[PDB]
Design a binder for this molecule. Structure first.
Ligand SMILES: Nc1ncnc2c1ncn2[C@@H]1O[C@H](COP(=O)(O)OC(=O)[C@@H](N)Cc2c[nH]c3ccccc23)[C@@H](O)[C@H]1O
Ligand SMILES: COc1ccc(C#N)cc1
Lengths: 323, 333
């Protein structure tokens, strides 16, 4: 099976777009690929934050990924800082990364924020990764990882796999509620544009009620991204939740107003989130289970990472550690 | 418990009399008075591109050199940097508490990027942060180094204070231990330039493993000055060569500069160079005799590395655990 690597930020407030898009896509491919999920706490600290909140956010993220369907017996899930090899390879790869390559990435800035693309390269290359599902903002970072890998391989032989982007997109379409021309993003400052995965039925109703529609007369529930972006977004959200096709929903809402659509979307989404939240709280409140998942995952990750790091260290010429 | 000493040297190039005077000499003398930890910093060495076989051999050359100088593994912890993962781990963490501007303003980064224009890599830039991690891991009180590492030391103090101010008494704020003489031994044909173990012009350098005969010839050919009459007097501005020779003589013999000036009253540069050559030739012959005894004993070198990495890891793991707890990471099971 090809090896797939994904970094999970312990701070990202995930949305229904993240879930019904990429995450649900990947949950159903855990037997097709050897999937690795790395909770990237070492990347998180490039932005200063409260220590207690970071610890909590790491465990929140773990429980949420488990709740979404990431299975720790099928896939490898672990906390980045638990595997020393990440930092070790990161330092080594700094020495095969041009300063220029980092300065070109798209004085009071901390060095972690400057240097984290090299750590990301190490994160990926440690596991002989074949595929990396990246968003547009991470394309440059992936390209650097490929250039580092090829550069190192040209000097020392085929030590790393050259990773590839995972090209196919999920197919689910979730746009911002007050700005339906742009994608619903977990990075949005305006939280009224998004539905978070831990929101209750009342919060979801409130946000869907506010969602931008059009001034068509009569109001008509039809799919048209150009002229009816808001109504189309509501249809896409509903279709993604229920599995009903757009033409099926258009027929279902024949002669109905936008109030009735919004009510059905709210109910459908909250139906989905209530089951996700049950699983989340069950996992999140079981400290023993989470500790076992992290220990097992770090052990699996470490076994693989140590093999790659040993090959790297031998290639570079370091005197082998005496155990 | 005793206060802690930490210092390191790269296994790249070939250690010079400069490296001995500025650092190793002090390392040997501090072993009873403080709890001393000395490191072969192979992860720093790879910031300059080396052949893999050269790197491995140089790591073991450096280890044998420490032993030959008088670094006793029964008194001091001696280890190879890459054998202790905590250096890399803390070095990443400390990147997040170091400003880009602090690194871009470094003299060593600018001198190194000038000399290695075709390999201005991120490791060369990030060098000082790993060095800070090297020191801070061991609750280090004293860092014996040459003058050229003063700026790197200042940063490691700033990082410790900055981190401590946020999180509590996690690190000791280390202090430099720079000797009065021999802190910055200068090149023999270019006494305004520091003596460098990676100098192309070999005649600028006195190698620790160089043939003493070759070293005595280099001393005889060292540039002095046009003073008429010749006068053996300390003046770095107008008498750089003679000053460097006096500084070398002072550092080997332990005699002060005014003592040497009185000693060479009425004498000229032949006397000075004779006495310098004698002192240095004697040191290196002895040093190199001990060296081969250690260097060819692979079982002993293996044991020293094993024991040292064990002792180091115990200290480093303690510090990293406190650092990780303070910043907010979930503790490893
Ligand atoms: N011409 C000279 N005259 C007097 N002293 C000199 C001369 N040239 C070099 N030195 C000193 O020798 C030590 C080793 O040199 P390195 O280049 O390996 O030294 C270096 O490049 C360090 N960054 C290695 C290091 C890495 N981590 C550390 C932590 C603590 C102390 C030192 C380190 C150094 O103390 C250096 O000051
Ligand atoms: C590029 O990632 C890293 C940079 C520096 C260190 C260290 N020490 C570890 C990782």
């Amino acid at each position: 099976k090809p090896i797939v690597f994904s970094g999970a930020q312990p701070s990202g407030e995930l949305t229904i777009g993240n879930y019904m898009g990429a995450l649900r896509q990947w949950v159903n491919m855990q037997d097709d690929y050897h999937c690795i999920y790395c909770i990237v706490d070492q990347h998180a600290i490039t932005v200063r934050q409260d220590a207690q909140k970071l610890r909590k956010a790491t465990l929140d993220t773990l429980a949420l990924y488990l709740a979404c369907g990431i299975d720790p017996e099928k896939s490898t899930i672990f906390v980045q800082s638990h595997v020393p090899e990440h930092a070790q390879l990161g330092w080594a790869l700094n020495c095969y990364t041009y300063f220029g390559e980092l300065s070109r990435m798209t004085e009071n800035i901390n060095a972690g924020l400057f240097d984290y693309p090299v750590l990301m390269a190490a994160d990926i290359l440690l596991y002989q990764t074949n595929l990396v599902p990246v968003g547009e903002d991470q394309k440059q970072h992936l390209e650097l990882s490929r250039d580092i890998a090829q550069r190192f391989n040209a000097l020392y032989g085929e030590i790393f796999k050259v990773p590839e982007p995972f090209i196919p997109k999920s197919g689910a379409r979730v746009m911002s509620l007050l700005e339906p021309t742009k994608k619903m993003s977990k990075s949005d400052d305006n939280r009224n544009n998004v539905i978070g995965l831990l929101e209750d039925p009342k919060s979801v109703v409130k946000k869907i009620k506010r969602a931008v529609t059009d001034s068509d007369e009569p109001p008509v529930v039809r799919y048209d991204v150009q002229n009816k972006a808001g109504v189309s977004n509501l249809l896409d959200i509903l279709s993604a939740v229920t599995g009903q096709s757009i033409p099926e929903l258009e027929k279902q809402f024949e002669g109905k107003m936008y109030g009735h659509l919004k009510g059905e979307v709210a109910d459908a989404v909250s139906g989905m989130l209530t089951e996700l939240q049950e699983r989340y709280h069950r996992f999140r409140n079981d400290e023993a289970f989470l500790q076992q998942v992290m220990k097992d995952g770090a052990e699996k990750a470490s076994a693989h990472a140590s093999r790659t790091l040993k090959a790297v260290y031998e290639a570079i010429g370091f005197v082998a550690k005496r155990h």
